[PDB]
Amino acid sequence: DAHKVGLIPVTLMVSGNIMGSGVFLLPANLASTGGIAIYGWLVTIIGALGLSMVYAKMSFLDPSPGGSYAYARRCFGPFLGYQTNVLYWLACWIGNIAMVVIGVGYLSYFFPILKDPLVLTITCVVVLWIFVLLNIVGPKMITRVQAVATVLALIPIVGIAVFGWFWFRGETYMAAWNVSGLGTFGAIQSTLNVTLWSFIGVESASVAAGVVKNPKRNVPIATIGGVLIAAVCYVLSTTAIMGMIPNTAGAIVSFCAAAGCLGSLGGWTLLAGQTAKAAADDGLFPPIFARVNKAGTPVAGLIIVGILMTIFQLSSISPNATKEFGLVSSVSVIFTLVPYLYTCAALLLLGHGHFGKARPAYLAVTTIAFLYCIWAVVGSGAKEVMWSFVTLMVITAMYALNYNRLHKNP
Amino acid sequence: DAHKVGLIPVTLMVSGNIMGSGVFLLPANLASTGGIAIYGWLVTIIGALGLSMVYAKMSFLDPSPGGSYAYARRCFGPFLGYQTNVLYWLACWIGNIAMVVIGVGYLSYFFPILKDPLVLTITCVVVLWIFVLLNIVGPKMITRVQAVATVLALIPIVGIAVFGWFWFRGETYMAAWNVSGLGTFGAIQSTLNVTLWSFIGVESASVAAGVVKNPKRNVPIATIGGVLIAAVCYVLSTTAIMGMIPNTAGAIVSFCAAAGCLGSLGGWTLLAGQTAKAAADDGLFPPIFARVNKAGTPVAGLIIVGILMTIFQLSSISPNATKEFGLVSSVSVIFTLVPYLYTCAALLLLGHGHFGKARPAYLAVTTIAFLYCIWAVVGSGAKEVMWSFVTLMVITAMYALNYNRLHKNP
């Protein structure tokens, strides 16, 4: 198959959905800290790379076509995996509405603007279907969108990596040094708590399956590529941290950031159609989507995701926490963790005896992945989390929509 | 079998674990409200009776011998059910330490006393093993303890039901009327939020199985008996609500309350040994307990529960929230919900097509049970709930202790 994309724009997708709509804000987020504190990066990147490794050698096997639910079919995988879906896709199109309220806030000036009245919302609303239709064109086309746009948002960051390496200069960062944070013991927390729940994305590769070239080779290479990429991106970019704290070619840096939300948005609508029109086939949901107009792609799928997406775009217009951490926009963050959980549960529930040799080695990386996934939700908002769990209780008993499973019957 | 108890002291067990260590405090808990507000009772009792009905017609089938995990073997039932255990048992012996810090605070005077220094703790510590050994004697003996002691704590409440019906008098309650609460719309919340998470217990019957007479008949009758009992107990007792708000034979009323924690404590250590030395056999945990010295009963089991119970009795001595809602003593409240959840999931996952006729009827009661269970955790402490969920993530990835399940393998 050649109408089914490949590594080159896949790793870019995978990377650029972590990159991605949070880097041009990351330094800011550890400015109110607590700043550098590079340690925070050390540990969050080590454990996250572990998570990407998990995903790598799992899609190394059954990709999938999901994934991150594919493997849920085998912590169980009915109930638990059909759940894992609801709560991930329902955190797939939801996290999108978040993505536009910021992505267009990134073009809040520089032509248009406007961008303050009802115009902000009317444009995020039409900016979404942009990518919905650009998925009805794909999937090979939406990945073509992401490739160009994120290598656009790569200009800024990568530019500061080496070029920023030649500018500043120098011992200024040494001047600001650590401190501000309330000491090393927990000081890290002030950084981890914003480099962690913001490494979210490694899934996209083992979630493309159904439209990557060769899964068993390209996809594992995809996540590991994506993670090492965004990772050094993160470090070299936010090590450009001299002393400031207050929060010509400037226009390019402001355009290239929104251009990350140019590719991202497509990417996540994509992930939205995938891990759902997937558990359409491996069983139930229910669907509906389907219906997969000939040549792949969920025609009903992404269109339906459009309706679900737009409906919330016009009532979170608007209050819901006017920015990040919105009791709805953040919870959907937590949601995307469970599938991190069962996955790693699976890269061992399906190495029952490992169709691969040397145990302890894989045995660590998965444990590490478990800290990372457990820690980055252990240390987060108290209304938000209880919330996820409320959704778990409700996802569950919303399987009355489901009286036909089986196992260990009577 | 006749060394295996029967309905007569079983329903008393089942009832007196909800009764039970919260009634002589219940009116107090809706005094700071918001008081009567009898509605709160209306809705909490209707949905709870639904929950008991759920449990009734489930143990009507497979009892079990668990239960409330028995049936988990069939939302899955490996991982999910072995979980459902950890999080219920670890909420079974934990809820106990809570039970003694109050049950002896109930004899904080009237002989002994003391009851304020290190003596409070040294006595709760030895008061626990009391029931641990009185379970090593049972299980028919511990139920004999609960029967006598709760029909002792029945004297107070039931006495006010009819006798209290002849005393006051009269329109005083009409004088205090509703109000104080911030209006009907949500006013109920101030009552439901303390009549709900305080109806916990209906499980005990469908959790005795392994030591009730005939399961299929006695156990269903047990929970429904238990619930209607504690229910009218609740209503007729806390309808003795005249106007007061500040918070000879008086000694009897103060003794008879602790005497509820005389029987309760035994009951829950009991439930502790049960839904664990049960998932010892249906599979894994791991155990250990076992080892079931001849004639039933988990000898290693309750003894081990003693060590786990005493260890926390001497470091929650002491701070941990010096009373109810202890971020550990309350969470373990939330924990005892999940098994409520999968249960009701099961009275339909195992009525796949109902080995019983007329669908919609059973179809409601289970839905109602789902509200009750979901609502009473939807509306509770924010650190506590996120906490349960953290335990869910950890229960989970603590099944590395478990690399040998199966289903839909590769």
Tab-separated table of N, CA and C in Angstrom, chain A residues 353-362:
chain	number	residue	atom	x	y	z
A	353	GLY	N	5.080	-14.303	28.505
A	353	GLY	CA	6.407	-14.870	28.593
A	353	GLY	C	7.242	-14.228	27.500
A	354	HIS	N	6.859	-13.012	27.115
A	354	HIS	CA	7.614	-12.222	26.161
A	354	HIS	C	7.952	-13.006	24.894
A	355	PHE	N	7.240	-12.750	23.795
A	355	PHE	CA	7.697	-13.231	22.487
A	355	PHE	C	8.971	-12.400	22.166
A	356	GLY	N	9.824	-12.227	23.189
A	356	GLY	CA	11.124	-11.556	23.101
A	356	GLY	C	11.992	-11.834	24.335
A	357	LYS	N	13.310	-11.949	24.148
A	357	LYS	CA	14.202	-12.440	25.213
A	357	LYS	C	14.795	-11.378	26.144
A	358	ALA	N	15.417	-11.833	27.231
A	358	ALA	CA	15.935	-10.946	28.276
A	358	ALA	C	14.805	-10.175	28.972
A	359	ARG	N	14.391	-10.670	30.138
A	359	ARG	CA	13.210	-10.157	30.847
A	359	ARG	C	13.452	-8.833	31.557
A	360	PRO	N	14.368	-8.821	32.537
A	360	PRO	CA	14.485	-7.672	33.442
A	360	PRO	C	14.606	-6.348	32.709
A	361	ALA	N	15.335	-6.339	31.602
A	361	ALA	CA	15.550	-5.118	30.839
A	361	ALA	C	14.235	-4.472	30.448
A	362	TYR	N	13.387	-5.195	29.739
A	362	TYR	CA	12.071	-4.679	29.419
A	362	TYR	C	11.297	-4.463	30.718
